[PDB]
Amino acid sequence: PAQDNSRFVIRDRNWHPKALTPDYKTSIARSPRQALVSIPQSISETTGPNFSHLGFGAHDHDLLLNFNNGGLPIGERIIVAGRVVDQYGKPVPNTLVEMWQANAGGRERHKNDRYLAPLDPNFGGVGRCLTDSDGYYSFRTIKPGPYPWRNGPNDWRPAHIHFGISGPSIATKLITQLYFEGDPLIPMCPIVKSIANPEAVQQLIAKLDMNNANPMDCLAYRFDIVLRGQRKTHFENC
């Protein structure tokens, strides 16, 4: 079974976006009005699932082939790669990274998406993978397109890919959004502006990575993720 042998650095709730950010309108009714109750870390918060033996399909990390309907998706072919480390710089191996995104037109494959950009018959939009020994993951996919949503009368989300990272404990699990280097929609989006510090915003911007590109084939972007620092317990209970 799991053993309580770690503590995780406390989160900075001023770096992460606050709960109530009124310009992202849906956060008004879904944010708590009472203060969070702080509790000490026990074995319930410092352990979590390990997905080493989950059986992955061969193309679970490859979105150009995982939804194959006899063709190749239309859109910019890219590899999205990166490394998952904790705040001390230590790689996080065999952790589960899950991602989902729109197609190249901004249309998502879900019953409730009625935007007019068409579905792509060869593109599903979901992928998953386990970080290797060194903390690296990689996915292949098509660059998603921006899309409008009913927030303000003319809001458009920037192209983004959603990520879900498990880490070693439930204290580390995190959902976020990856955005693309240079995209001018970024500073105008009320979701991205739910983050107050412009330096935290930068951490979500994936950079063009010509070094990992496959010449004559696909470009590559680099997104490194940092999970809460993990440390051994010391002097506890005496």
Binding site: P1, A2, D12, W15, H16, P17, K18, A19, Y24, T26, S27, I28, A29, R30, S31, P32, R33, Q34, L36, V37, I39, I43, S44, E45, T47, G48, P49, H53, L54, G55, V85, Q87, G89, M99, W100, R109, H110, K111, N112, G124, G125, G127, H162, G164, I170, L174, I175, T176, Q177, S194, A200, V201, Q203, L204, V226, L227, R228, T233, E236, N237
Partner: protein
């Protein structure tokens, strides 16, 4: 002071979280192995129960696009981390409320007792993470049981909540669904009866 690398900031899971994380629930084809809501196969030790609940925003309206992650000890109070669709019991699971079903459900076993780090027993609990559109950073809460009033009164985590009435929002109501013992746990995100949420 010593600064370390800053954590990647959180963002909302957004409306279509079901697509990457609840495939069946997004009405999309599934892969062979999915992380879902059945933590205990029928031959697993313990008492089998059904958990169900709904989510409310601060106007009293249902949240039909939520996604919840759970984490619990088995009937002996042991957290089973090696996740595997062939174990009789897995400590982790996921569930969701959709437009079709406004209520999530989970099949598992009543968790046994674990101690806090100081060695004091915590009452049986389930650890919950809630994620949805409008929630910029996920909300942590714990579900306790109304049939464990003795142990709930001594829980060192429940006694950190100052006001007694606030402790009540974490206690799921035992009922019966199809002759199966079930507990209902509703989450109120905001307002009257607002569920207690934690930070750790």
């Amino acid at each position: 002071p010593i600064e370390l690398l800053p954590e990647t900031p959180s963002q909302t899971a957004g409306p279509y979280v079901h697509i990457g994380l609840a495939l069946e629930a997004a009405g999309n084809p599934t892969r062979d192995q999915e992380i879902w809501n059945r933590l205990a196969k029928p031959d697993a030790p313990g008492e089998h129960i059904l958990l169900l609940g709904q989510v409310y925003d601060g106007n009293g309206h249902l949240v039909r696009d939520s996604f919840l992650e759970v984490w619990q000890a088995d009937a002996n109070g042991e957290y089973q981390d090696a996740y595997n669709l062939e174990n009789a019991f897995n400590s982790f699971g996921r569930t969701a409320t959709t437009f079709d079903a406004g209520e999530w459900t989970l099949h598992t076993v009543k968790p046994g007792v674990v101690n806090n780090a100081a060695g004091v027993p915590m009452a049986p609990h389930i650890n919950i993470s809630l994620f949805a559109r409008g929630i910029n950073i996920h909300l942590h809460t714990r579900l306790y049981f109304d049939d464990e009033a003795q142990a709930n009164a001594k829980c060192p985590v429940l006694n950190l909540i100052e006001q007694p009435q606030r402790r009540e929002t974490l206690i799921a109501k035992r009922c019966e669904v199809d002759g199966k013992t079930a507990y209902r746990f509703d989450i109120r995100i905001q307002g009257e009866g607002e569920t207690v949420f934690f930070d750790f």
